[PDB]
Amino acid sequence: MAGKELRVEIKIDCGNDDKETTYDLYFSKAEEAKELLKKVAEKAADKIKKQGCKRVKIRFEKKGLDDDARKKAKKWALEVANKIANELGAKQSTTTTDGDTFEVEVILELEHHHHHH
Numbered sequence: 001m002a003g004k005e006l007r008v009e010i011k012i013d014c015g016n017d018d019k020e021t022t023y024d025l026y027f028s029k030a031e032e033a034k035e036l037l038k039k040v041a042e043k044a045a046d047k048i049k050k051q052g053c054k055r056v057k058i059r060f061e062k063k064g065l066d067d068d069a070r071k072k073a074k075k076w077a078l079e080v081a082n083k084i085a086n087e088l089g090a091k092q093s094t095t096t097t098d099g100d101t102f103e104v105e106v107i108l109e110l111e112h113h114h115h116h117h
Contacts, residue, residue, distance in 0.1 A: 003063040006073060010040050013055035014047045033072045041083035048088055052113045056084060056106035058093075063100060077104040084108070 010023035023043075025036045047053045058077050062070065081093035081104060090108040 003061070004065070006065060006069060007061045008036075008073065009059045009061070010044075011057035011059060012044050012047050012053065013057065014051050014053045027069065027072050027076070030072050033076050037076055037080055037083075041080040044080075044084050045087040048084070048108070048110070052088075052110050054088075054090075054108035054110045056081075056093075056108070058102075058104040058106070060102040060104075061100065062102055073102070077102065081106045 006027040008023075008025045008027065010025070012021045012023070014021070023040060025040070027033045027036070044053075044056055058081070060073055060077065062073065065073075077095070078093070084106050085092065085108065088108050088110050090106075090110060093104050093106040096103040096105075
């Protein structure tokens with residue numbers, strides 16, 4: 001409880017009806033960041049499979065981190081966004097840097113779904 005700890009809150013919008021889906025993950029090693037990278041980017045794409053969940057929002061809290069710790073989570077937010085994009089289509093994520101929070105939301109341009117002859 002200080003703001004040293006890298007608290008990542010991943011918001012996956014599958015059409016928010018019941019509750020906002022918040023995923024709790026922490027970074028310290030770049031290897032951990034990479035492990036969480038494949039977890040979030042796969043599990044997000046799994047939600048998109050049914051509804052075409054084309055709204056994704058990555059929120060991350062940071063303040064008392066090292067320049068390296070900042071770079072781990074920064075590069076992370078890009079690569080998971082490009083992975084979620086790679087699975088379905090679209091272009092890129094919308095990136096917003098802030099003092100306390102870090103908002104990178106992946107707006108997928110995906111109308112074309114369920115093509116069945």
